[PDB]
Design a binder for this molecule. Sequence first.
Ligand SMILES: Cn1cc(-c2ccc(NC(=O)[C@H](NCCc3ccc(C#N)cc3)c3ccccc3)nc2)cn1
Ligand SMILES: [Cl-]
Length: 328
Amino acid sequence: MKFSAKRLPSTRLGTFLENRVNDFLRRQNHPESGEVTVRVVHASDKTVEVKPGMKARFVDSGEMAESFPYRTKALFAFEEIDGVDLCFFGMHVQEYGSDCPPPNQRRVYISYLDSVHFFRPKCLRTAVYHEILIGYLEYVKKLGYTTGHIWACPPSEGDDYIFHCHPPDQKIPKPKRLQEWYKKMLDKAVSERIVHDYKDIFKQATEDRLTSAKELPYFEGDFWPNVLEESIKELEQKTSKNKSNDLSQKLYATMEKHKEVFFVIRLIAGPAANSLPPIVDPDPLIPCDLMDGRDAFLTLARDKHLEFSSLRRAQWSTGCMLVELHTQ
Ligand SMILES: Cn1cc(-c2ccc(NC(=O)[C@H](NCCc3ccc(C#N)cc3)c3ccccc3)nc2)cn1
Ligand SMILES: [Cl-]
């Protein structure tokens, strides 16, 4: 096709990921694998606003910024199977640069990732997912991002993060299996000396000596900002007849209850982390309404009856997805 994955415009980030993946596959020399293309298909600037409860408590008193700028990116990976492109992996990320106020400075957060399980061969599928995620971590570490953040959260039964209508036999992993999948990825990144270490959110808070909710990173659509609003509302209902840091107390209790699902990934440790030059992303903005957040691509798939529920339909929906991205 003139409208194929390869023909999408290149980026430094996407070239870096696809090089790392195809290096890995060539080394495996499995006769069923195909070439992998990776493309960034959206990049734009955004802000995340501190919600009303935290704003009244921290923003209005001058203690915390009112909002946090970031860049969002969407990227997708494609394999050649029978000479045709199959989109098999997608990811949306938020990147908070060196200009961003604390506590968000130099952090990346994975918003959503997703897959369609037809990568060939099956036995290298997980490895390839891992290479993409490790590659992203390596890449942002080199720009000078110091910390990665993952919320391990499977989609609900019958729901789709990125790709509309998954195969009926592609199973959603249970939380513990997913948590182990991320640990396996992160142990490999640690052994390649990309990741220095990683910690659950609770342990990390304790080790950073977090004494106020304002010190907690505040991301778009993440669990912690909602938690903080519900906790402030609970606290404000309290009265006491006659004869503080109570938010912090509740945050800690909630962090401990859920610590296993929130990964804090240190990419740059020690004094190296404190003398860094400004983060400069060499890649340009990529406006693309279709891939600005997850919803627009889910809608278009529904409208045009695109489905990722078999090899043939996913190959079909990849082709139409590509048509649409050159087209728009
Ligand atoms: C019939 N039906 C299938 C689904 C369905 C099945 C699978 C998926 N998505 C994934 O498996 C996706 N896969 C991403 C790659 C991946 C593969 C295996 C494991 C494990 N363990 C972790 C990630 C994923 C995203 C976020 C969290 C967990 C999974 N999404 C939806 C919904 N309805
Ligand atoms: Cl996810």
